[PDB]
Amino acid sequence: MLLKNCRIIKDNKIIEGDILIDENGRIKKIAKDIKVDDEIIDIKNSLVIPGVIDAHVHFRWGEEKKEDFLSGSLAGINGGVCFAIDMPNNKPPITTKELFYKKLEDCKKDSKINVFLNFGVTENNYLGTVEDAKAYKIFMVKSVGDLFIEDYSKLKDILNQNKLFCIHAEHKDVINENLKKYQLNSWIDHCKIRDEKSEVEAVKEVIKNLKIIDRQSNKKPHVHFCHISTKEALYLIKKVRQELKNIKITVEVTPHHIYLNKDMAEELKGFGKFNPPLREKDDNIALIKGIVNKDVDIIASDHAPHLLEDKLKNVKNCPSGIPGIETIVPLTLNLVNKGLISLFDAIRVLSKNPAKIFNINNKIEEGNLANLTIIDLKKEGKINAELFKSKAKFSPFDGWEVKGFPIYTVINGTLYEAYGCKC
Ligand SMILES: [Zn+2]
Ligand SMILES: [Zn+2]
Ligand SMILES: [Zn+2]
Ligand SMILES: [Zn+2]
Ligand SMILES: [Zn+2]
Ligand SMILES: [Zn+2]
Ligand SMILES: [Zn+2]
Ligand SMILES: [Zn+2]
Ligand SMILES: [Zn+2]
Ligand SMILES: [Zn+2]
Ligand SMILES: [Zn+2]
């Protein structure tokens, strides 16, 4: 198959050319005006970027009414996402090697995009190695089962390893304190119970332990902070990066923590309830500036589908989490069109930095498997949750008019239509 009239992001620049994909799905040739006897698809000078990686999804293994590998990967295709990294807080949680490989087999059977699995860290399993895991996920607060580090004094031992750790950083003790101070009456109370200090104190807890390791140890962990949402945590991470010599720290943010704030809590209801919760407009701004200043490394969705039925309950009964794999690319491109980040910033946080951090080769280079996101940068259109392929057909962004959509998703050489090629 020949994709003609592409504008390709290769290295630091936009080149015009055609992309020839052989029938093994590998890029065979990149050159202007290629002339071959093959199937030809005219890209009409749309932008071709290395396939987008969503480094933070929950595809709900064990809870397949919420989402499964098929609906999740169809959602990914629809969102222009070529690679997704799925978290281990399943029913049961992925805390043993056998559970990991039993989930990996189900994943291989029906996933239509490139899905990788993270391993769940407990106080009991933390020295184990799982060769096919992309990263080791630490929850500092209750998720499911024993997937929860309840004793923070063990964090130094857990982190003192040559491993890639992802961390959900909210402080259990701050949240417990706040639960004695506030009642969950309305949606804003969720934001007061899991307040900004609960995130900042969890980040401080981790950093304190990394400083010890950096000087007293030969181990070189890479620590990736999931969904950072506060200006103070970003500041602390910026500071400590200047002090650490052996330990790399990366930062991810979500679209909802960039766009939404707690003044919207009562209007968003269940669709605004997620962990960490809605913050202040000043935090939105800090995260956007953090992308421009390269303090924020990646954007990931924290795609967390639940049943619509449960998301319509009151604040006490409503589960935390929203779907987001189908809105992450348009919401990020929308920032480009509003002049808040540059096009190359968008590429860096959706495609290039996730590929470096998690060791995923999505490069548009001859000989590589073709994993491409093809976008129409200027297409204006409404987000319409009825057009989602996820089982979770709802969103706080439903009805938003944004500019910039994926139109095609290429998965290992196979061309699919994305959300924008029906918009
Ligand atoms: Zn072909
Ligand atoms: Zn022929
Ligand atoms: Zn299904
Ligand atoms: Zn999380
Ligand atoms: Zn690393
Ligand atoms: Zn310090
Ligand atoms: Zn704030
Ligand atoms: Zn998550
Ligand atoms: Zn229910
Ligand atoms: Zn119910
Ligand atoms: Zn308009």
Curated annotation (Swiss-Prot):
GO terms for molecular function: allantoinase activity; dihydroorotase activity; zinc ion binding. Zn(2+) 1 binds at H56, H58, K137, D302. The keyword Metal-binding applies. Keywords: Hydrolase, Metal-binding, Pyrimidine biosynthesis, Zinc. It catalyses: (S)-dihydroorotate + H2O = N-carbamoyl-L-aspartate + H(+). GO terms for biological process: 'de novo' UMP biosynthetic process; purine nucleobase catabolic process. Its cofactor is Zn(2+). Its EC number is 3.5.2.3. Pathway: Pyrimidine metabolism; UMP biosynthesis via de novo pathway; (S)-dihydroorotate from bicarbonate: step 3/3. It is an enzyme of class 3 (hydrolase). It comes from the Archaea. The active site is at D302. The keyword rRNA processing does not apply. Binds 2 Zn(2+) ions per subunit. GO terms for cellular component: cytoplasm. The modification N6-carboxylysine is found at K137. Pfam families: Amidohydro_1 (PF01979). Substrate binds at H58, F59, R60, N89, H306. Zn(2+) 2 binds at K137, H168, H227. Belongs to the metallo-dependent hydrolases superfamily. DHOase family. Class I DHOase subfamily. Catalyzes the reversible cyclization of carbamoyl aspartate to dihydroorotate. NCBIfam families: pyrC_multi. PANTHER family: ALLANTOINASE. This is Dihydroorotase. It comes from Methanocaldococcus jannaschii (strain ATCC 43067 / DSM 2661 / JAL-1 / JCM 10045 / NBRC 100440).
